[PDB]
Amino acid sequence: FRKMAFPSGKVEGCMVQVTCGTTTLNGLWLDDVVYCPRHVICTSEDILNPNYEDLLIRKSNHNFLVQAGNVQLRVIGHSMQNCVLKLKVDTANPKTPKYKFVRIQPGQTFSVLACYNGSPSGVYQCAMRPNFTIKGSFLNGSCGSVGFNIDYDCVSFCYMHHMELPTGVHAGTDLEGNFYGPFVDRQTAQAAGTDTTITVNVLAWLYAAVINGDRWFLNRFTTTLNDFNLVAMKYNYEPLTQDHVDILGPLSAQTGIAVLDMCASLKELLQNGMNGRTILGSALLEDEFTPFDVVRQCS
Amino acid sequence: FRKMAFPSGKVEGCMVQVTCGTTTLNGLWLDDVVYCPRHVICTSEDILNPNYEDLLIRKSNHNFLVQAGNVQLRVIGHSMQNCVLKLKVDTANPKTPKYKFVRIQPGQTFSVLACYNGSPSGVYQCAMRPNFTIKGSFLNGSCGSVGFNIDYDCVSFCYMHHMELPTGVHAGTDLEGNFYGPFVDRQTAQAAGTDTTITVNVLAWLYAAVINGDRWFLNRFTTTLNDFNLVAMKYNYEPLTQDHVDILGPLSAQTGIAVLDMCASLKELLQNGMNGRTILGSALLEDEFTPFDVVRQCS
Ligand SMILES: COc1cccc2[nH]c(C(=O)N[C@@H](CC(C)C)C(=O)N[C@@H](C[C@@H]3CCNC3=O)C(=O)COP(=O)(O)O)cc12
Ligand SMILES: COc1cccc2[nH]c(C(=O)N[C@@H](CC(C)C)C(=O)N[C@@H](C[C@@H]3CCNC3=O)C(=O)COP(=O)(O)O)cc12
């Protein structure tokens, strides 16, 4: 049981390279539109406090150079939706999969296709933390890389990458240009709210540990939902809802461990620690696996 | 720092399914040849102790159903190479990338595209252990899934999946059909050799830490290679090779820390312990990042 990303071929066929002036980043080419972060129009001066509608009315179609591999697409239009620039081109991408723009909830996961200069570099799995950051791996030139899920040949795009906080975590927008969290596309050191642990995902990952024949953390005891949430909130874990309990049903049915039983296990793990032992190789409680993540891998 | 797979699109376009009787597994379609595990020709009463040579003589080209999606590709030739079947087909795969077949060393990492009935399911990075096993995530129907590295648009295929040992780790061959490690393609419980820690990768991980300003573990001593290797084996660490010293070159030059000085630093860490202090946020030493992996995620 490992962190597993969706195959990235369908998104790879859409990554292009967008240049305005002296700056370059990645864009997403679907049908005849290219989507990219709008601060690609900005200069070193502008970046500190950009008045984007002002900067954009002064740009022309010919100020944008879009490259798909070695061929250049001609831009025939440009508009701005929140933080994303939409560049119309005179060519439809034949590799455009069935797709949808969606806004992810905190706790949900997606695959990130890291790109540099319109070339895909790597793929890995991330979760939207409760404080609307993600713990990614991105360098200079990765802006415009997207996050996505795949559901029966439909690619749901949910993330476009914009910045790296001083603490080394990452921030970005949905494909409608709206940031996840309180961040802004201006060149400033920004801080996020206090992060908390995704409780439903820790539980799913304990269930995963048992599906793979590991059980040392189990115990005989049980807890009520409310009493687990009291201890949980004490340790900066998100609350567990009855919806979460329902979602975990399959995992409980498969292993024969009721949810509130597994909660009693996690409570004791929080109150006492791991005592040097490890779960699925990890020395810390993992919270970047959704219950759907677990079932899809184990079956 | 994240475990990061290569983008999987060039390999996705090469995945097909190969059916003999009622057993279906995955195959790899490059130019006009399909590669797959030979035990696809086995019946459930044959897998215990197959006579592959005798089994193959009774097979004809029309006993083999090769499908890209639900589209059939006609088999026009067949032959066996160690444990892989090679099926010549009547169509050259137009999505064939520039490619190589290569045999990796323990410690090297690679990306696995987990496939079922010729359809990609997921992608993740594995390291080849010193006992020639990989810590995979595979279900029934996964045999013939391949592992690969991509360097400058050329795909180097290094693994084809065959087996899950009773301990839950996995085993397979290179693309010429030679098993990694002492295993055989028969339906029997086989045991891996005792595993050890991949020393070259731990050192890579120490260089990563230094690059990020975490360097308390650096010391004023050096060692000879042989002296380090003798000590390393007493701690269940792999001995260093001359090639290992060579692939630490870039990290050594970038940090100004000589390889044998970093060995002396690691050697003190083995004799004395971490004393509660951490490295890159952790109390255990990571051994599944290669020196190329570190260079990739730092630059
Ligand atoms: C003084 O201000 C600061 C103080 C302290 C911390 C700070 N952090 C940022 C920031 O992150 N700024 C965004 C651009 C703003 C305008 C939204 C950025 O730099 N994004 C990168 C991806 C980043 C690059 C490194 N790792 C990534 O993930 C692009 O890809 C585009 O820029 P490039 O063309 O590649 O250089 C500003 C800042
Ligand atoms: C009774 O003997 C045993 C005792 C104890 C442990 C044992 N383990 C194996 C084994 O692994 N046997 C190979 C068959 C070959 C080696 C002849 C196999 O089962 N390979 C799977 C991949 C596996 C499936 C689950 N997770 C994977 O990685 C395929 O994909 C092909 O088989 P399928 O037709 O797809 O089911 C036999 C065995």
Numbering used by the authors:
A (entry chain B), B (entry chain A): 3 to 301
What did the study's authors say about this model?
The main protease (Mpro) of SARS-CoV-2 is a salient enzyme that plays a vital role in viral replication and serves as a fascinating therapeutic target. Mpro is able to cleave the bio-synthesized viral polyprotein 1ab (pp1ab) at 11 specific sites to produce a variety of mature non-structural proteins necessary for viral replication and transcription. Among these, PF-07304814, also named lufotrelvir, is a highly soluble phosphate prodrug of PF-00835231 and a first in class 3CL inhibitor to treat SARS-CoV-2 infection. In the current study, we expressed six Mpro mutants (G15S, K90R, M49I, S46F, V186F, and Y54C) that have been identified in Omicron variants including the recently emerged XBB.1.16 subvariant and solved the crystal structures of PF-07304814 bound to Mpro mutants.
The prepared samples were successfully crystallized and the crystal structures of PF-07304814 in complex with these Mpro mutants were solved to 2.29-Å (G15S), 1.95-Å (S46F), 2.05-Å (M49I), 1.75-Å (Y54C), 1.97-Å (K90R), and 1.70-Å (V186F) resolution, respectively. All these complex structures are in space group P1211, which is different with that (P212121) of wild-type Mpro-PF07304814 complex. Two of these mutations (G15S and K90R) are distal to the substrate binding site of SARS-CoV-2 Mpro, while the other four mutations (M49I, S46F, V186F, and Y54C) are located in or nearby the substrate binding site. Though four other substitutions, namely S46F, M49I, Y54C, and V186F, situated nearby the binding site of PF-07304814, no significant changes were found in the orientation of PF-07304814. Similar with that in wild-type Mpro-PF-07304814 interface, a C-S covalent bond is formed between the HMK warhead of PF-07304814 and the active-site cysteine (Cys145) in Mpro mutants and a tetrahedral carbinol complex is generated. One obvious difference is that a water-mediated hydrogen bond with Thr26 can not be found in the interfaces of mutant Mpro-PF-07304814 complexes. The binding energy between wild-type Mpro and PF-07304814 is -9.2 kcal/mol. Among these, PF-07304814 shows the least binding energy with V186F Mpro, but shows the highest binding energy with M49I Mpro. The binding energy values between PF-07304814 and these Mpro mutants are − 8.9 (V186F), -7.4 (G15S), -7.4 (K90R), -6.8 (S46F), -6.6 (Y54C), and − 6.3 (M49I) kcal/mol.
